[PDB]
Amino acid sequence: REAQEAGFALSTNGERLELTGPGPVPAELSARLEEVTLGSLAASAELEV
Amino acid sequence: ALRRLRRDWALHYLNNRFEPLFQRFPQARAYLEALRARLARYAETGEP
Numbered sequence: 029r030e031a032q033e034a035g036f037a038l039s040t041n042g043e044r045l046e047l048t049g050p051g052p053v054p055a056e057l058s059a060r061l062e063e064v065t066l067g068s069l070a071a072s073a074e075l076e077v
Numbered sequence: 078a079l080r081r082l083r084r085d086w087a088l089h090y091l092n093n094r095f096e097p098l099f100q101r102f103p104q105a106r107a108y109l110e111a112l113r114a115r116l117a118r119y120a121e122t123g124e125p
Contacts, residue, residue, distance in 0.1 A: 073094075
């Protein structure tokens, strides 16, 4: 939702997350994309636990 | 610089992983930090 509202398309591949869109990604959007990816893999960590 | 990045992002992830552990186990401050560097070195030099 925040990516579409920002004019960028989110191309998920499961755990892997990337953004395709015109121009540079905003710093907030890039940081939050990194946050979502690390949160997904940390959820996978606690899943292994 | 790329190797340094592969350590900066490693610490950025490890801080988030370690904050609950530091809150739960303050007496293990020395031990938990010891992992934090070591895992970082695993990200840095690829040392097993």
